[PDB]
């Protein structure tokens, strides 16, 4: 538990370690991670004050939930 500059990193961080173990065989711990990041992440957006600033992470959000869920099915036999 550590707070760094006030920031996205925190969140977006959490996705390389999931997105890790979703390769060396252990998806289901990368769903549990998933689910929790773009969960922190929408709330990072809500607070936000400037629609050019949120209006990014809008997209990139998308491409985080779409990942997660193909990792379902490649761990899927």
């Known amino acids: 538990s550590d707070h760094m500059t006030m920031s996205l990193q ?4 959490n996705v390389k370690l999931a997105r890790e173990y ?3 065989g ?4 990368a769903m549990v991670y998933y689910q929790g990041v773009l969960d ?4 990072y957006l ?3 004050k400037d629609t050019h600033l949120r ?3 809008q ?3 998308q491409e985080i939930n779409v990942e997660a869920k193909q990792v ?3 761990m899927k036999t």
């Open 55 to 57: 209006q990014k992470w």
């Open 72 to 74: 379902k099915d490649i």
């Open 40 to 43: 922190q992440m929408n709330k």
């Open 22 to 24: 979703a390769l060396l």
């Open 10 to 13: 925190m969140i977006v961080e």
């Open 26 to 29: 252990n998806y289901d711990s």
């Open 46 to 48: 809500y607070s936000v």
């Open 59 to 61: 997209q990139v959000w």
